[PDB]
From Swiss-Prot, chains B, C:
It comes from Homo sapiens (Human). Optimum pH is 7.8-8.1. Homotetramer. Its cofactor is Mg(2+); Mn(2+). Pfam families: malic, Malic_M. Its EC number is 1.1.1.40. The modification Phosphoserine is found at S329. Keywords: Acetylation, Cytoplasm, Metal-binding, NADP, Oxidoreductase, Phosphoprotein. Coiled coil: none annotated. The active site is at Y95 (proton donor), K166 (proton acceptor). NADP(+) binds at residues 148, 262, 294-311, 401. This is NADP-dependent malic enzyme. It comes from the Eukaryota.
Length: 562, 563, 563
C-alpha cells in the first residue's frame, strides 16, 4: 500500500510509520532499525493487550487519557486499533468528558504537542504557519478559539485538547484518515484570569482581541486554509462563543465547506432522538410542543432543525415556530422582552413574562422538554410529575454534561414518571429496573453519532457546502438504525459499539444523494456507493512500507559484460 | 556551537535538539516549526517548574521513573537539567533502587525503546546491528546480559533499564556526553520461567546459551565495538553472573578499555570509606583485620583492592592477604573446605571450619566488619556488642540493599556500640542522635561516587587500559574530599549533592597521572588539566543550533549585475 | 513563496531549489551552504552571461544541447531563463531538430537521467514505478514508446529525449510548472538492430511486444497515472507508430484527459496557417480544394480538422469531405484501391487510380497543396508552375523536415510562382526578395505554437476531455494573432519570439469557453480569466526559499522566567 524513503532511527519517531514490535525481522533489517527494538515480534493483538493492561492498572481517567495520547504520538495505527477494540470504553477517555479535564490541566501536563497553533500576531502570515505542518494533504480541519469549551468556558490555548480529541473520533468512529486531519487552535488571547496569572500557561498572556481585527484574522484563516488545502477541505468550528459561532457560520457556510458541530451537530443528534421517540408516542412531529431549557448554540441549532423537520412534514415556517419555546437565565423567551438576540427573537412568541421553570412547564404544558443549559437538577420532582400528568409518554431530554450538570438522572425520571417517560441524556446512566420487573436502557445523545459520518460523506463525494438538509437527513438515518425492540427497551439511539456502522450508513446517504442531485464534485461517479465509501475508510491494519520487489526474466535482468 | 541540517517536524522528534517551549520565536521561524508549539516562550528554569510540578502529583517512585524517561526521550537537555537540580532526589529514581522495579515491569511498561539490543542469533552480524544506532561517535558503553540484576536475579532482556539508568548518571554525575553513550543488552535467553510464560515478554523466549557459544559471542561483541568506535571506547560490564563477570574481566581488561562496576566500582567506594574511617581510628590499614560477610563479585573485588592498598604501604602480597577473611553461605572460607573457587581459595587460610557468624566474629576479632550478602539483620545485637568490645571504634559497613536486606540499621548499630561504631551503608539511613547530644549522619556507599568520574577521566586522556591503581587512587581522592568535620559527624563520604565536583577531582587525578606516567593517548598535552576536563564535561544549557550569521563588507557582499 | 526543509549539500543537488551564485550571503548562511560556493554573488542576468559565453564557444548543436541539459539538471530556473532569453534560438536546440540527433546518440551520451522509464516487464507494477518519481503533483505527462521518432524511425528507449525536450517547451513557451511535468518512455523493445547490437544500448535488448500484451500494458499505464495524479492530469502521446497512435487516441480520448500531438497538434497549426492564408486569398475555406502529399498521422489529422472547420461554416460532413484529396506511397487515395485503412477510406472518392504527383495535381487542380511525406523536392518546377496557373494565389505548405526533406524551398516556390504563392514550411527558410522590391518572410508551422497553450488551458480550468473543437478554436486564435501587415509580408504565423503571449491567448480562450460552456472543473470561477491564467504560469524568477521571519510585540515574544 504505502511507500516511504524514511529509514533508520527517524522512522521509529514517525507515529504514522512506526509499528514498534509489530515490525518483522525482515522489515527491521530492510529499514536499518534491527537492534533498536527488543528481539520479540508481536501481532497487533498482543500490542493491544499490553496497552490495555497498562490502561487498567491506572487509577484515574486522566492518567488513562495521558497514556492513550502518548500512544497516539508514538504509534498511530495501534492507537486507533485500541480505540476501536472497545469504542464505548475509550471514547469518553479521548473525548468528552475526560478531554475537558485535560484542557483544564493542559498547560501543566503539556508535553508532546499536537496540532497547529495560530495566533492573532501571525496575522498576514497564516499561510507560512500552515507550511510547518508536515502533511500536505488535508481534508478535514477542526478549529477552535477556546472561548467556550463546553461547560468550562474560556480556556484559551489550553482548548487545543478539544480539536485533537474530536479528530481522534473523526478517525475512530468515521474512518477519516488522521494524516489528512488537522487540529487547529486560534489564540487571540483569553479572559480567564487564572490562566493570565498561571506562570505555566502555554498561551498568549493577553486579553481577547475583538471586533474587526478578529474578524479579518478569521477571514485570512479561511482563505489560507482553502487556498492551500483546496475548497474541498472540510472546516469544522468548535467551542466558539455564542455570538461569534452563529456569525461565522452564516458568513462562511455558502462559500466554504464548513459547519459548526455545537450548533448543527447537536441539532442532528437531538432530532434523531425525537424521530425515534415518535415511533413510541406513535403521533407526529406536528403534534409536539417543545420546551427548551437553554437558548445557547445547541438549543437554537436544535430548534432550527426541528423547524426544518416540520417543513418537511409540509408545515410552513411561521406555524412550525409557534410550537417551540425557549428559556434562558433571564426567563422565558417572549415577544417584547429585554436582552434578546436576532436568533432568539424568531422564537419570541407573545406571552406573559415568566422566570421560574416549574411554572413555565405548567403553563406551556409541553410534550417534549429538552435541557441543554447545564443546570444540575433543573428537572425537579415537580417538573417530572407535571410532565407525566400533561402527557401519556413525556419526552425528557437531559442532554447537559457531565452527570453533575445533568437536568435529572435516569432513575429520578423513570421513578417519578412511574415508567412512562421517554428519556435520553448526554451523560451515561445505568439501566433502571421498575417494580413491574421491566428494565429500561436510556441512551446518550452523543454528538459522535453525527460528525464522523457527515465529515466522511462530505469529503468522500467532494461536497462543497454543507446544508441543513444534510443534518436533517443524517438524523433520519440514525433513527432508522433503531429497532422497535430498542425502543421497547427505552433506547432512542443505536448501541454505541455500532457507531462505525452508523457513520458509514450516514455517509452513504450523503454520497448517494449527492450524485443524485448533482452536488458531488468527485468523478467519475462510482457504480457502488457503499463500496466507494468503504474504500476511503481508514483501516487500523498496519500498511506495508517495504518496497514492492519483483523480478524480470533473467535474460534482460543479467548484468552486461560484453 | 553545533549546526544541524535537520528541520521542521522531524527536528522536534530529536531529543538531542528539541527545546520545546525554550525555542525562541526566531529559532522556531528559522527552523520551520513555528505553529507546532503554543505561543509561549519559557526559560529552562520554567520548564523545570513544569516537570517538578507534574512530578510531585505522582504517588509512586515507579510513575516518577516513567515521567522522567518520557522526558529523556523528548528533551535530553531538560531531563539532565532536572536530574542535576536535585541529584540526591532524582538519582534513586532513574537508577537504583527504582530502576530495579522498572526492570521487573519492563516488558509490561515497554514504550519508547532506548539503547541497543543484540542477541546470540545476531552472531556473525553484530557489526551490522551497531550500524542501526544513529550516533557514530561512542566513548562509553554499558552492557549487561541481565543474568544477575543486583538483588533481583535474572530479568533477561528486561535488564535494559540498568545500562540506560546508569548512563543517565554517567552524564548527570560525571558530565559524560549522552550522545556518546550507548546502553547495550546482550540477550542470550533467560532462566526466569515467569518471563518465559509472560506473553508480553519482550526478550527471547528461550533458555540461556552457555559455554563456547556464549564465550565466542562476547568475543565478537568486543571486536565489533572496538573496531567501530575505536579501542579507546570505554566498555563497562554490569550485572553479569558471578563466574562470567570474573572470567570476562580477566580475559579483556588487558586488551580492551574495560571494567566491571559491580566488582571494581564497589571495591573503590568501599575502600574509600575505609580510608575515611582511618582518619577516625587514627591507625593505618595494615593494623586492620577485615571480616567480609559475602564472597561474591563485590566482596572479592573489595578484598582484592584492599590488598593493593596494603601493598602500597610496604607489605608484600602474602602478609596482606592474611588480614582478610571471607564468609559465604557455606560458612567461613578456609584452606581445605569444599565448594571453593579460584578467587576464594586465594583467601583460604589454614583454619578450622566455621559457619555461625557470631562465633566467626568472636574468633577472628576483626576491626572492620563488611556485609554484602544481602542478608537483613545479619549483624545481630551480639555481633555489634562483640565488635564494640574488641574495638574502641569498630568499623561496620552494612552495604547490602535495600534497607530490608541491610545487615543492620544505623539506629541499632550506633545504639548497641554506644555511639562508638564507625558506620556506613549501601541504603540511606536518617541521622541518629546519641544520648551525649551528638548527632551522627551515616553516609552511603553508592557506586555513583566512582564510575562517573573514572569514565570521564579514562576517556578524556584516552587511557587504553584501566588498572586497579586507577580505582585505588580514585578511592583516595574520594576520601580526601571528606573534611575532618564530616568525620566527627560520622560521615565517611562527601555529600551526594557534591557528586559533580567529586567526579571532576577524580577525573583530574586520572588525567594528571596518565600524562605524567605516559599512558595518555590524547595530545597535545594540555597545560591546565583541570580546565581540560571541565571543557569535556556535558552542560545542561541549551546549545545554539541556528546557523552562524555574520555580514561581509558591502563592497564584496553586493549582488553583481550587468554594468 | 515556498518553504523548504532541505538544507546543506543536498539542497545544492536539487535543481528546483539550487540558485548557484545567485544565492545571497544571508541565504547561504541560513541554508548551511556558506563555503560550498565561491565568494561572489551574481544576479540572474550575470548567470545568463556565463552560460551564453560557454554556449558560443561550442562548435556543434549537439554539444550545445548537452550544455543546456547539464544546466537543466543543475539549476532549473536558470535553464528556463536562458531558454526564454532567445526562444527562437534555443527552441531548435532543446527540441526538434537537434533533440533528434541527441536521441540517436542517447545511449552513448547517457549521463544524468531525466524522466521515468516504464517497461513491459513492469506489467502489473506500474503504480510502484510511479512512486519512484519524487514529485507527487503531476499535471502534464508526455509519453512515447520510441517506435516512430519523426523522420528518424525506431529509436527505442533512446526516444526519452523527445518527451524531455517537449516538456522543456511546455514550460518555456507555455509557462507550465516543470516540477508538475513528467516525461515517460514505455520500453516494449525495439526493431532497430543497430541498437540491438550496440553494447551501450540503455534499453531492453529485445524485439517489440505486440498485440494484447501491448494493448493491456497501455491500459494499465493510463489507469495507474490517472489513479495517482488524478483524472485531470494531461497525458500526451508522442511519436507512436501510425496504427497504434490512432487506436489509442480513439480508445482513450473520451475517458482520459489525453491527446496526440503528432496528429491533433500538427492539425491545429496547419489549419491556423490556412485561416491566415484566407485573409490573403480573401475567400472562404469552403471555396478551397486541398491536396495532401502524405496520408499518415499528420495528414489525416489535418484533414479531419479542416472538415470540422467546414462543418462550422455550414456544410454537412459529406460535402466537406469531397474537397480533400490524399496521396500516399502507393498513389492517389480513391474508392476501390488496395492497401487502404480506416481513416484513409473515409477520404476515398470515386476516381480512377493515379500515382504521378504532377498528373494528380493537373487533374484535381487544387487551391492548397500540403506536403507531409518527407520527400525532398516533391514539389517540382512543374507542380509549382501548374499551381500558379490554376490559382492566382496558390497555397503551398511544404511542412516536412528537415530542410533536406522539404517538398520545396521558399526560394524556388516564390520564384516559379512569380511571387504569388502563399508559402509555409515546417523547416525555417530565410526571407526571399522578389524582383518587384517586395521581400517575403515565409513562416514556420511549428507544433510549438499549439501544445503549450492548449496544455496550459486544459489544466488551468481542469478540463476533463480535449475535443477537436479545442484545436480548431486554438487554430483561430493563432491566425487572429497575425496582423494584416504580416500577411502582406508573407507570414502566415506570428513571430516565434512572441510564442509566450500566443500560448497565453490560446489558454485564455480555452478557459473562457470552458467556464461558459460548463466544462471546467476548477472552482470558484475567476472573474478575470486573463489574470487567472497568468497566475498559473511558471516564472523564471528565483523563488524565495528562506523561512518567513517576522516579529511579535515584545510583551508576548519575551522569554518568561522565574519571577
Amino acid at each position: 500500500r504505502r511507500h516511504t524513503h524514511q529509514r533508520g532511527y527517524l522512522l521509529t519517531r514517525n507515529p504514522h510509520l512506526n509499528k514498534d514490535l509489530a515490525f518483522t525481522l525482515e522489515e527491521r533489517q530492510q529499514l536499518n532499525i534491527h537492534g533498536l527494538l527488543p528481539p520479540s515480534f508481536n501481532s497487533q493483538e498482543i500490542q493491544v493487550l499490553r496497552v490495555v493492561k497498562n490502561f487498567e492498572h491506572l487509577n484515574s481517567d486522566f492518567d488513562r487519557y495521558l497514556l492513550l495520547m502518548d500512544l497516539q504520538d508514538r504509534n498511530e495505527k495501534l492507537f486507533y486499533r485500541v480505540l476501536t477494540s472497545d469504542i464505548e470504553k475509550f471514547m469518553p477517555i479521548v473525548y468528552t468528558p475526560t478531554v475537558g479535564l485535560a484542557c483544564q490541566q493542559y498547560s501543566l501536563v503539556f508535553r508532546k504537542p499536537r496540532g497547529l497553533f495560530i495566533t492573532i500576531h501571525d496575522r498576514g502570515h497564516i499561510a507560512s504557519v500552515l507550511n510547518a505542518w508536515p502533511e500536505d494533504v488535508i481534508k478535514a480541519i477542526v478549529v477552535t478559539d477556546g472561548e467556550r469549551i463546553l461547560g468550562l468556558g474560556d480556556l484559551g490555548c489550553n482548548g487545543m485538547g478539544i480539536p485533537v480529541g474530536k479528530l481522534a473520533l473523526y478517525t475512530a468512529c468515521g474512518g477519516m484518515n488522521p494524516q489528512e486531519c488537522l487540529p487547529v487552535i486560534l489564540d487571540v488571547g483569553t479572559e480567564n484570569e487564572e490562566l493570565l496569572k498561571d506562570p505555566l500557561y502555554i498561551g498568549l498572556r493577553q486579553r481577547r482581541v475583538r471586533g474587526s481585527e478578529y474578524d479579518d484574522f478569521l477571514d485570512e484563516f479561511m482563505e489560507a486554509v482553502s487556498s492551500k488545502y483546496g475548497m474541498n477541505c472540510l472546516i469544522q468550528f468548535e467551542d466558539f462563543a455564542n455570538v461569534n459561532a452563529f456569525r461565522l457560520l452564516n458568513k462562511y457556510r455558502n462559500q466554504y465547506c464548513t459547519f459548526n458541530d455545537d450548533i448543527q451537530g447537536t441539532a442532528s443528534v437531538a432530532v434523531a432522538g425525537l424521530l425515534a421517540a415518535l415511533r413510541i408516542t406513535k403521533n407526529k412531529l406536528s403534534d409536539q410542543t417543545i420546551l427548551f431549557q437553554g437558548a445557547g448554540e445547541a438549543a437554537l441549532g436544535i430548534a432550527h432543525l426541528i423547524v426544518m423537520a416540520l417543513e418537511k412534514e409540509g408545515l410552513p415556517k411561521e406555524k412550525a415556530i409557534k410550537k417551540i419555546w425557549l428559556v434562558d437565565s433571564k426567563g422565558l423567551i417572549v415577544k417584547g422582552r429585554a436582552s434578546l438576540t436576532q436568533e432568539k427573537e424568531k422564537f419570541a412568541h407573545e406571552h406573559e413574562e415568566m422566570k421560574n421553570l416549574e411554572a413555565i412547564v405548567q403553563e406551556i404544558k409541553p410534550t417534549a422538554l429538552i435541557g441543554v443549559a447545564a443546570i444540575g437538577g433543573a428537572f425537579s420532582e415537580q417538573i417530572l410529575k407535571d410532565m407525566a400528568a400533561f402527557n401519556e409518554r413525556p419526552i425528557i431530554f437531559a442532554l447537559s454534561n457531565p452527570t453533575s450538570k445533568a437536568e435529572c438522572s435516569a432513575e429520578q425520571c423513570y421513578k417519578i414518571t412511574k415508567g412512562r417517560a421517554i428519556f435520553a441524556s448526554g451523560s451515561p446512566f445505568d439501566p433502571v429496573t421498575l417494580p413491574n420487573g421491566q428494565t429500561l436502557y436510556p441512551g446518550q445523545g452523543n454528538n459522535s453519532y453525527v460528525f464522523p459520518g457527515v465529515a466522511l460523506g462530505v469529503v468522500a463525494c467532494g461536497l462543497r457546502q454543507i446544508t441543513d438538509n444534510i443534518f436533517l437527513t443524517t438524523a433520519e438515518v440514525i433513527a432508522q438504525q433503531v429497532s422497535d425492540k430498542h425502543l421497547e427497551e427505552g433506547r432512542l439511539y443505536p448501541p454505541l459499539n455500532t457507531i462505525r456502522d452508523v457513520s458509514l450508513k450516514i455517509a452513504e446517504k450523503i454520497v448517494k444523494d449527492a450524485y443524485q442531485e448533482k452536488t458531488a464534485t468527485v468523478y467519475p461517479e462510482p457504480q457502488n456507493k457503499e463500496a466507494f465509501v468503504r474504500s476511503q475508510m481508514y483501516s487500523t491494519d498496519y500498511d506495508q512500507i517495504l518496497p514492492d520487489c519483483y523480478s524480470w526474466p533473467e535474460e534482460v535482468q543479467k548484468i552486461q559484460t560484453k
